[PDB]
């Protein structure tokens, strides 16, 4: 079989920059290589076929080239909507094989998150579990530290984070951290606090509520 080695794994650049993604075939594949773009939760989209030919309707800022067994995809003026995984594929021999993918992300100016907190709903409290949600909205860069405190006690092992993909227009991220407790434990304590550390904030920000406050 033929393998396609794609590099780098991740590439980050500013809007307007020229970016270069590479794919290397383990042996001669002539020009039988295509490039696909896959945005979050979308199907692969053909960009380039037979190494260098632009598929109809694909913007001209995308181009492909070949030197021997080395293949390159270039995006000449990176746009925020270009954030995606990019895959090469050879059809020279069966099985046709794909590269492992290159993720392309956007670099932009620092933005501190809007920090919000949500107590468990009364409905959820009707049964036996409490979820407390801390939301960090529209920030950059992705790195952020979120810590939970219940009656000033630092929590460990009882929260989970989810982070959105980079926004296709403003290139920001949003993040949720969810603290899960039993109803009995939630009703045993008073102060629930989410503390956020991020590059855009001059010092950490704590968002907090007392159980029972309206």
């Amino acid at each position: 079989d033929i393998q396609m080695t794609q590099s780098p794994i991740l590439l980050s650049a500013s809007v307007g920059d020229r970016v270069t993604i590479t794919c290397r075939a383990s042996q001669d594949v002539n020009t039988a290589v295509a490039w696909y773009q896959q945005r979050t939760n979308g199907s692969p989209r053909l960009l380039i076929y037979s190494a260098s030919f632009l598929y109809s309707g694909v913007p001209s800022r995308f181009s492909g080239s070949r030197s021997g067994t080395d293949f390159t995809l270039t995006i000449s003026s990176l746009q925020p909507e270009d954030i995606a995984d990019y895959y090469c594929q050879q059809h020279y021999t069966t099985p046709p094989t794909f590269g492992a993918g290159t993720k392309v992300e956007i670099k932009r100016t620092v933005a501190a998150p809007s920090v919000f907190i949500f107590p468990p709903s009364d409905e959820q409290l009707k049964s036996g579990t409490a979820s407390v949600v801390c939301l960090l909205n529209n920030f950059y860069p992705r790195e952020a530290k979120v810590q939970w405190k219940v009656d000033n006690a630092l929590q460990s092992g009882n929260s989970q984070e989810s982070v959105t993909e980079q926004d296709s227009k403003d290139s920001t991220y949003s993040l949720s951290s969810t603290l899960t407790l039993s109803k009995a434990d939630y009703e045993k304590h008073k102060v629930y606090a989410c503390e956020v550390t991020h590059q855009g904030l001059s010092s950490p920000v704590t968002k907090s509520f007392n159980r029972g406050e309206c």
């Binding site: 809007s114 919000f116 907190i117 949500f118 107590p119 468990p120 709903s121 409905e123 959820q124 049964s127 979820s131 949600v133 939301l135 909205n137 968002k207 509520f209």
Partner: peptide, 19 residues
């Protein structure tokens, strides 16, 4: 799934917008 509201409140608002 069970579906629960994340109600907007004084703790989910800033700058005149609310989550």
């Amino acid at each position: 799934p069970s579906v629960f509201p994340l109600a907007p409140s004084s703790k989910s608002t800033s700058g005149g917008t609310a989550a």
